Design a protein around this ligand. Sequence first.
Ligand SMILES: *[C@@H](C)[C@H]1/C(=C/C2=NC(=C\c3[nH]c(C[C@H]4NC(=O)C(C=C)=C4C)c(C)c3CCC(=O)O)/C(CCC(=O)O)=C2C)NC(=O)[C@@H]1C
Ligand SMILES: *[C@@H](C)[C@H]1/C(=C/C2=NC(=C\c3[nH]c(C[C@H]4NC(=O)C(C=C)=C4C)c(C)c3CCC(=O)O)/C(CCC(=O)O)=C2C)NC(=O)[C@@H]1C
Ligand SMILES: *[C@@H](C)[C@H]1/C(=C/C2=NC(=C\c3[nH]c(C[C@H]4NC(=O)C(C=C)=C4C)c(C)c3CCC(=O)O)/C(CCC(=O)O)=C2C)NC(=O)[C@@H]1C
Ligand SMILES: *[C@@H](C)[C@H]1/C(=C/C2=NC(=C\c3[nH]c(C[C@H]4NC(=O)C(C=C)=C4C)c(C)c3CCC(=O)O)/C(CCC(=O)O)=C2C)NC(=O)[C@@H]1C
Ligand SMILES: *[C@H](C)[C@H]1/C(=C/C2=NC(=C\c3[nH]c(C[C@H]4NC(=O)C(C=C)=C4C)c(C)c3CCC(=O)O)/C(CCC(=O)O)=C2C)NC(=O)[C@@H]1C
Ligand SMILES: *[C@H](C)[C@H]1/C(=C/C2=NC(=C\c3[nH]c(C[C@H]4NC(=O)C(C=C)=C4C)c(C)c3CCC(=O)O)/C(CCC(=O)O)=C2C)NC(=O)[C@@H]1C
Ligand SMILES: *[C@H](C)[C@H]1/C(=C/C2=NC(=C\c3[nH]c(C[C@H]4NC(=O)C(C=C)=C4C)c(C)c3CCC(=O)O)/C(CCC(=O)O)=C2C)NC(=O)[C@@H]1C
Ligand SMILES: *[C@H](C)[C@H]1/C(=C/C2=NC(=C\c3[nH]c(C[C@H]4NC(=O)C(C=C)=C4C)c(C)c3CCC(=O)O)/C(CCC(=O)O)=C2C)NC(=O)[C@@H]1C
Ligand SMILES: *[C@H](C)[C@H]1/C(=C/C2=NC(=C\c3[nH]c(C[C@H]4NC(=O)C(C=C)=C4C)c(C)c3CCC(=O)O)/C(CCC(=O)O)=C2C)NC(=O)[C@@H]1C
Ligand SMILES: *[C@H](C)[C@H]1/C(=C/C2=NC(=C\c3[nH]c(C[C@H]4NC(=O)C(C=C)=C4C)c(C)c3CCC(=O)O)/C(CCC(=O)O)=C2C)NC(=O)[C@@H]1C
Ligand SMILES: C=CC1=C(C)[C@@H](Cc2[nH]c(/C=C3N=C(/C=C4\NC(=O)[C@H](C)[C@H]4CC)C(C)=C\3CCC(=O)O)c(CCC(=O)O)c2C)NC1=O
Ligand SMILES: C=CC1=C(C)[C@@H](Cc2[nH]c(/C=C3N=C(/C=C4\NC(=O)[C@H](C)[C@H]4CC)C(C)=C\3CCC(=O)O)c(CCC(=O)O)c2C)NC1=O
Ligand SMILES: C=CC1=C(C)[C@@H](Cc2[nH]c(/C=C3N=C(/C=C4\NC(=O)[C@H](C)[C@H]4CC)C(C)=C\3CCC(=O)O)c(CCC(=O)O)c2C)NC1=O
Ligand SMILES: C=CC1=C(C)[C@@H](Cc2[nH]c(/C=C3N=C(/C=C4\NC(=O)[C@H](C)[C@H]4CC)C(C)=C\3CCC(=O)O)c(CCC(=O)O)c2C)NC1=O
Lengths: 55, 248, 164, 164, 164, 177, 177, 177
Amino acid sequence: FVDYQIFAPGTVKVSPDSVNANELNPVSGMSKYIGKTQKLVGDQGISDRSDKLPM
Amino acid sequence: AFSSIQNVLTDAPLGTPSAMGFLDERTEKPLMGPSEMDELVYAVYKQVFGNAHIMESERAELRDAESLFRYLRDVREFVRALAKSNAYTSRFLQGNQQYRFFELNFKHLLGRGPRSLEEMASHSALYAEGGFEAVIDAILDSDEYAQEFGSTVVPYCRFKGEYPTNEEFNRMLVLKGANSTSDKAGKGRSKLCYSIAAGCSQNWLSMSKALPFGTEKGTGFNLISSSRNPAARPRIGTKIPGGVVFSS
Amino acid sequence: MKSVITTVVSAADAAGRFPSNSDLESIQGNIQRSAARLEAAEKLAGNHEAVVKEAGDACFAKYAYLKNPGEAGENQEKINKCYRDVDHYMRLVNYCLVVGGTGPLDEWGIAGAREVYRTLNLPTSAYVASIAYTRDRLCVPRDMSAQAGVEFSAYLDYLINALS
Amino acid sequence: MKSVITTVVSAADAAGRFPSNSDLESIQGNIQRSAARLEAAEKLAGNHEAVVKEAGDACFAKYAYLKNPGEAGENQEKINKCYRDVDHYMRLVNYCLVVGGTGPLDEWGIAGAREVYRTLNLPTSAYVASIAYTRDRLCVPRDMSAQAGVEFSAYLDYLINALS
Amino acid sequence: MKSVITTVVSAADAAGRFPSNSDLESIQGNIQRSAARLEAAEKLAGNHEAVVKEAGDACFAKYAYLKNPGEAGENQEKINKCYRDVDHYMRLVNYCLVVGGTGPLDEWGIAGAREVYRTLNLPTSAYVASIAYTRDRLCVPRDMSAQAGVEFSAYLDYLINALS
Amino acid sequence: MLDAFSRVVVNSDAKAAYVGGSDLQALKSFIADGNKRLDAVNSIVSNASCMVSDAVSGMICENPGLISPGGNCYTNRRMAACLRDGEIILRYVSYALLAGDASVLEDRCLNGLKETYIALGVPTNSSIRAVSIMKAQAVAFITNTATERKMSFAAGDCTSLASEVASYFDRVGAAIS
Amino acid sequence: MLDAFSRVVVNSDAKAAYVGGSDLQALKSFIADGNKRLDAVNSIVSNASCMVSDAVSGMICENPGLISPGGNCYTNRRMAACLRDGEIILRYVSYALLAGDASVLEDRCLNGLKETYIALGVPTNSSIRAVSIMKAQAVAFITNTATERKMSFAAGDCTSLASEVASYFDRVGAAIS
Amino acid sequence: MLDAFSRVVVNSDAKAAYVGGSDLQALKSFIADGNKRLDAVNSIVSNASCMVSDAVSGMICENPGLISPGGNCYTNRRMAACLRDGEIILRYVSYALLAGDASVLEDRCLNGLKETYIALGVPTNSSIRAVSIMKAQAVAFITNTATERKMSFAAGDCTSLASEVASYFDRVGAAIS
Ligand SMILES: *[C@@H](C)[C@H]1/C(=C/C2=NC(=C\c3[nH]c(C[C@H]4NC(=O)C(C=C)=C4C)c(C)c3CCC(=O)O)/C(CCC(=O)O)=C2C)NC(=O)[C@@H]1C
Ligand SMILES: *[C@@H](C)[C@H]1/C(=C/C2=NC(=C\c3[nH]c(C[C@H]4NC(=O)C(C=C)=C4C)c(C)c3CCC(=O)O)/C(CCC(=O)O)=C2C)NC(=O)[C@@H]1C
Ligand SMILES: *[C@@H](C)[C@H]1/C(=C/C2=NC(=C\c3[nH]c(C[C@H]4NC(=O)C(C=C)=C4C)c(C)c3CCC(=O)O)/C(CCC(=O)O)=C2C)NC(=O)[C@@H]1C
Ligand SMILES: *[C@@H](C)[C@H]1/C(=C/C2=NC(=C\c3[nH]c(C[C@H]4NC(=O)C(C=C)=C4C)c(C)c3CCC(=O)O)/C(CCC(=O)O)=C2C)NC(=O)[C@@H]1C
Ligand SMILES: *[C@H](C)[C@H]1/C(=C/C2=NC(=C\c3[nH]c(C[C@H]4NC(=O)C(C=C)=C4C)c(C)c3CCC(=O)O)/C(CCC(=O)O)=C2C)NC(=O)[C@@H]1C
Ligand SMILES: *[C@H](C)[C@H]1/C(=C/C2=NC(=C\c3[nH]c(C[C@H]4NC(=O)C(C=C)=C4C)c(C)c3CCC(=O)O)/C(CCC(=O)O)=C2C)NC(=O)[C@@H]1C
Ligand SMILES: *[C@H](C)[C@H]1/C(=C/C2=NC(=C\c3[nH]c(C[C@H]4NC(=O)C(C=C)=C4C)c(C)c3CCC(=O)O)/C(CCC(=O)O)=C2C)NC(=O)[C@@H]1C
Ligand SMILES: *[C@H](C)[C@H]1/C(=C/C2=NC(=C\c3[nH]c(C[C@H]4NC(=O)C(C=C)=C4C)c(C)c3CCC(=O)O)/C(CCC(=O)O)=C2C)NC(=O)[C@@H]1C
Ligand SMILES: *[C@H](C)[C@H]1/C(=C/C2=NC(=C\c3[nH]c(C[C@H]4NC(=O)C(C=C)=C4C)c(C)c3CCC(=O)O)/C(CCC(=O)O)=C2C)NC(=O)[C@@H]1C
Ligand SMILES: *[C@H](C)[C@H]1/C(=C/C2=NC(=C\c3[nH]c(C[C@H]4NC(=O)C(C=C)=C4C)c(C)c3CCC(=O)O)/C(CCC(=O)O)=C2C)NC(=O)[C@@H]1C
Ligand SMILES: C=CC1=C(C)[C@@H](Cc2[nH]c(/C=C3N=C(/C=C4\NC(=O)[C@H](C)[C@H]4CC)C(C)=C\3CCC(=O)O)c(CCC(=O)O)c2C)NC1=O
Ligand SMILES: C=CC1=C(C)[C@@H](Cc2[nH]c(/C=C3N=C(/C=C4\NC(=O)[C@H](C)[C@H]4CC)C(C)=C\3CCC(=O)O)c(CCC(=O)O)c2C)NC1=O
Ligand SMILES: C=CC1=C(C)[C@@H](Cc2[nH]c(/C=C3N=C(/C=C4\NC(=O)[C@H](C)[C@H]4CC)C(C)=C\3CCC(=O)O)c(CCC(=O)O)c2C)NC1=O
Ligand SMILES: C=CC1=C(C)[C@@H](Cc2[nH]c(/C=C3N=C(/C=C4\NC(=O)[C@H](C)[C@H]4CC)C(C)=C\3CCC(=O)O)c(CCC(=O)O)c2C)NC1=O
């Protein structure tokens, strides 16, 4: 694991997905960011693994 | 012992200023004065009696217990003097059954419901050895009354969160009602009497009438039955990788 | 929901009294100090994305150790739950400036927070450093009015006091 | 003592709370009504000997049977004690305009008075006929200001509802 | 499917006749109207994951009681089946703009629906509030054209009147 | 309880939305004529002793079998417990006119009230007439159309305040119906 | 309440029998394996704070509508009450594993629990899911097959204690269903 | 429990005069600086958790034998109780500053406080110091001369109200002596 305290201050960057209570989680549980409902996206089912090799 | 309802959704409990006034040697208490006094007496009259709506010619017989209360500022002695009155036995002892009288002593003087048949039968063991004054002074001089109310505050219905039985919270909610609710509406007839002696529980709509404002009063009821079947043996299985294990 | 109206009639009900001539004066204070706490509230409503974007990375510029394995913001779901929990708090600061008292904060945001954040190892000092960043980010003639900054920076350090 | 300040500091003490923003908004309403309920209070301090001498000699205009023997004021000695018990109320109406609440009325001039006026055979309905004579003789646009009228008339009407 | 072709073929099959001159005149209406209703069916088929998820939480923004115990939005599976069942309905509206009639909505979405949403206790006014939100979200020059929005909304309130 | 400002907050928390710029002109127009809410709650509670007396005394004059033996305000303990029982109905309406919302009327006064009035033999069809007499008297104090007690107000209208309090008396008038 | 020795003597009291050497061979093996019963309950109370917070937040993970507006784990007020409740359930099943009889879990904790939850609005399908996570956490500490946190035991089988405590966790689901 | 308006009337019932024109100017010089009093009491309650924790920890620094074994702030149970006590003292002085009258502090807090500390062994020579730390820290936050946290105010004179809240800390240090 990276320690993240041994770096200089200002070099660890973080960024949230949206600064909103209502896009991170709606009134229903259909949240794209919080919880186990991050697999329910219409894309991101297949991938690009014909980039590498037949290894 | 967190209790998400208590000082959040209800009010704060009323009472005297402090308990350090008894150790003060030039006074007996922070002296409240007769606007700060009688509005505390309004809260003892609304709690020991239910909402009994006592008249002007019924409060005149309680003239002596207030005149001692505004000098000796103990709240517990005022509650003890009001439970030995004629106005407490003509409402809760005279035309009621024995477990109706006992279940209102837990409401008026403890703010909870009785947890057991063994706890309830020991209050009838004190009726045989001293009558109704042996029941009342044993509640007042108990350890449970000392470490919740003391001499300082009125005995209020306290949402604790960490009840010693879960059924104790249920019988507290049946006993208190809404604020437009007194305790003469049944003709005698203890409400908790069947559930104490059998060991079952209460009805969900009767408890959720007495819950505060803002606590989902009634939802969660499936449209099938409201209690549990003690004879049912369900199969609850856990998924492991291979199959499903019924650790029963 | 402690406000000016929901305390003067929760004392009028505790003695069994009518609306007194005392309590008709306390709603005359709701007429006067409304226009500094409504104009501080409406400024927060059209600027909310900007003020919680800057408040949230004040936690992470300060505390780089939170991305370590086992700490609070160790993955992107937890970073998204950090910026949610400071979007909730300043929504309640917007709510307290409408009701006029500290009612919506201490029964939706503060009650339970000692017990929730201890069990989940969320540090209180990182919650404070986000809210104390935007308390002195407030500029007195530039952002809002003079007395409107007093109302907005009364509920902020209420929340810094009650968390610490 | 019932005032507008003692309500919000006993409601803060009962929950163990510091004086927050809803409490300080209620003191701001006491600054607004102080320009009317003090000017009516100072008007009653110099005009009393022409208005407590208007009430009781018109109390006996409606209630003529109180000068009869066997009733209350059968001699001149008790009428001079009848003008003491209406100078004791206008001196307490004057105090509650100064302090804002109903404190000097309810805990001095009201508490206990149901039982003294029951046992000592004094009719309460001549006090109601005499306090209300100072209500309808009061007009606004010569005697006092507009909001000094409606604060004085709302404090004469408090103990009319308490004695009835 | 109930369509323009299958109506005029079935009408001329029960009568036992060849396609007449009035049966070819109806398919010409299917030509001049196909430009508008295929624009709506292509606009919907490209942006359907964002239209479904915007309407799925418009159910729970109106009816927050569905997360209570025993209700239909308790756990994660029940909201996965709820966003599915809304996406099923938006697929059938895409199928109705392509075919040209209410065929796929009748046979696959509406027939048998009253007996399922009552047996499983799904509140049918919440399978409506998501459909009614999409009908008023549509801006008539922004997303599609004028006549493409007439066709899009007319299949959207056919479903509303069939659930009501 | 919720007042008229905290009602708008618990509607927007269901949306998880900030109280923006569109709801605030329903709350700046609450406090604009907000003198008149204080200038008319004072018109009820100044006359509230006479108002409960004329309410139940007109309840006798249209159902004269209440004071017959068997009726529920026959004896002298029962007649004192319905002068005072309509004091509490008049008190929680005057809280709700001060608050702008019927939350403190419904939680603290209307919950379980009919549930006890069938348990005590209170005839609920004649207690509706007890409420609706003082409903008519309260809305003419606010309108200042009474015969006696012409309380000097300022010029304008309180037509919406007269109908908000008439909705509050219809809430208690439908709860025990 | 009873324990595993008191459960035998109330069975013999229905027959007025003596607890003799036929009945005593179940109780002579309860004391023979009695070191392993103590060895298993400090495998649970040493990890009990980690077990509760993983089970409650693992229930939030499979159901994110519990923390949206209208979920019943929404604010700090409701989430701390859910964390308190799962610690109470884990406390009473550690009493029941120690005694060897599920009496004290069934009358104090579970009796009347279904009626509290349908009056307070608590969802019972997700509440069963938080108990069913910490059932699987409890059988992994007893058999020493957890991925972190290998504790130091002695060698043998504790496979009848792991399924005895799995039946105590199954009574919680059967009582709130 | 009085305030500053309820002090001039309990000095005037003894003479039984109307409060007339001569003594009403002393309360018109209360509502002149009424917004000055409201601006002053907001600055204490915004800094109150820092004012206590700097005071009690400086008492440990000025008196390092307090955390020795046998000391009064030795263990964690005792150290939390002294921080609990300084919260109540700073709360009751701020009640007195808002009312403008010491009769909220002297009754509800100072009755029996001298006899309780000698019954518990709480030493008064350190609590005269730790009250007097936050006495001098309260006049910094009123007159804006604090080192950190320059709060935003209006330009005027507040040195009468800073001395008036110094006198409430003299009423504490007299009574616990
Ligand atoms: C969200 C808007 C709702 C809510 C909805 C639920 N609907 C549920 C099940 C369901 N929906 C349908 C109709 C759907 N299936 C189809 O094949 C087609 C057309 C091609 C449609 C429109 C069916 C037949 C079913 C039952 C079968 C199933 O399990 O999918 C549902 C599941 C019910 C359950 O879990 O028992 C939910 C929860 N839930 C809400 O809270 C609001 C009301
Ligand atoms: C505290 C961290 C303990 C510890 C506890 C264990 N947890 C075990 C299993 C487990 N945990 C979760 C919740 C986790 N999964 C998620 O998807 C999410 C977020 C949404 C979380 C927080 C689940 C679902 C499970 C499995 C339960 C099941 O299968 O139904 C566990 C079991 C053993 C194992 O993981 O192999 C233990 C012991 N683990 C530790 O070492 C520290 C002491
Ligand atoms: C199954 C849960 C474990 C495992 C368990 C075994 N533990 C065995 C013996 C054992 N455990 C303790 C400590 C326990 N006894 C106490 O009295 C107290 C507290 C007061 C505790 C925590 C002791 C003392 C012993 C006895 C051996 C010794 O004295 O060192 C054990 C041996 C069988 C038996 O003698 O009962 C087993 C199999 N070992 C495992 O591999 C799984 C993971
Ligand atoms: C809260 C953290 C405020 C704050 C208040 C102030 N305290 C001030 C001075 C002060 N602090 C102590 C305790 C300190 N001195 C020590 O020697 C030790 C450790 C052993 C500690 C913790 C003392 C004794 C004093 C001086 C009191 C006196 O002698 O008059 C102070 C400066 C003086 C003043 O302006 O009041 C302030 C502002 N300090 C802060 O920065 C935040 C805002
Ligand atoms: C009238 C003849 C006197 C007078 C009377 C006052 N007594 C006051 C209080 C008081 N009186 C008693 C004695 C009485 N009350 C009882 O309960 C019992 C025993 C059952 C007896 C004999 C007590 C105990 C008290 C104190 C209780 C209380 O605080 O009310 C009193 C009130 C004083 C005050 O306002 O603090 C009065 C005025 N005083 C007189 O000047 C005349 C001569
Ligand atoms: C960001 C400044 C923090 C940080 C925060 C995390 N918070 C996590 C969860 C969380 N936050 C709250 C409070 C919030 N929820 C509400 O409903 C309201 C008011 C309406 C507020 C303020 C709660 C109750 C929870 C727990 C439940 C949940 O998941 O939503 C969180 C996830 C917890 C976990 O890791 O298991 C994180 C990471 N993270 C940071 O690094 C700083 C300290
Ligand atoms: C017309 C009434 C207004 C207007 C409204 C806005 N709509 C906004 C976003 C938006 N609208 C829709 C629905 C519509 N687009 C579609 O693709 C379909 C069906 C296939 C429909 C019914 C969606 C899905 C979205 C989100 C995606 C996006 O456009 O960013 C919008 C932006 C704010 C918002 O997120 O809602 C506005 C202001 N816009 C106008 O200019 C006229 C005045
Ligand atoms: C968390 C896993 C649940 C959940 C829990 C909530 N429980 C709430 C209140 C509550 N829970 C209990 C039962 C508990 N207390 C006991 O004393 C015993 C047995 C000894 C048990 C099992 C009681 C009695 C109460 C009410 C008392 C009180 O808290 O004052 C609760 C609060 C509801 C509210 O704020 O309205 C919650 C949220 N809810 C969930 O969603 C998960 C599944
Ligand atoms: C702190 C700066 C002191 C100090 C304080 C201690 N006080 C302890 C107990 C205690 N303190 C009070 C008074 C407090 N309670 C109130 O209600 C009010 C005002 C209204 C005040 C000031 C009481 C009544 C008690 C007894 C209750 C209890 O013990 O919790 C205490 C603990 C004593 C013990 O553990 O036996 C401490 C350490 N001690 C110090 O060194 C500084 C000077
Ligand atoms: C002494 C501590 C300061 C200083 C104080 C002054 N403050 C003045 C005015 C002022 N303060 C407030 C806010 C206050 N009123 C409220 O109703 C509430 C909360 C509910 C608070 C916190 C207001 C509204 C005002 C009035 C001016 C305005 O409306 O903008 C002030 C001016 C005189 C006065 O009205 O009191 C002074 C001198 N200024 C100083 O020099 C020191 C540092
Ligand atoms: C603080 C208590 C207080 C009151 C209740 C009134 C009462 C009052 N009225 C009058 C005396 C008077 N007051 C009026 C005024 C009026 N007559 C009417 O019918 C009109 C409605 C009204 C005009 C505003 C008149 C015309 C007289 C002289 C006639 C009389 O004796 O009433 C006097 C004699 C001295 C004086 O004129 O002030 C007093 C004390 N004034 C007070 O200071
Ligand atoms: C059977 C015997 C019998 C009675 C006792 C009275 C009772 C009574 N009074 C009023 C009617 C009224 N009651 C009042 C109230 C008051 N009027 C005042 O002069 C005071 C200031 C205040 C308290 C006494 C007013 C102002 C009206 C007139 C209608 C109105 O203006 O609202 C009404 C009409 C209510 C309605 O229409 O529903 C009734 C039934 N009438 C009867 O038939
Ligand atoms: C917060 C709201 C609130 C209320 C409204 C009351 C509701 C209420 N009223 C009564 C009690 C009563 N209520 C009535 C009222 C009436 N009977 C009639 O014939 C008229 C139609 C009507 C108005 C005069 C009477 C006569 C009694 C007394 C019955 C009795 O003495 O048994 C009781 C029983 C009290 C007791 O004696 O123990 C209660 C709870 N209490 C509350 O706390
Ligand atoms: C502490 C107690 C307290 C009060 C009693 C009120 C007193 C009060 N009422 C009004 C003011 C008013 N009052 C009325 C009301 C009416 N005029 C009528 O002809 C109708 C009969 C009646 C409707 C109910 C109107 C119309 C105004 C002026 C417009 C407004 O600002 O609301 C005003 C503003 C001054 C003015 O506009 O003249 C004040 C201070 N306010 C308080 O703070």
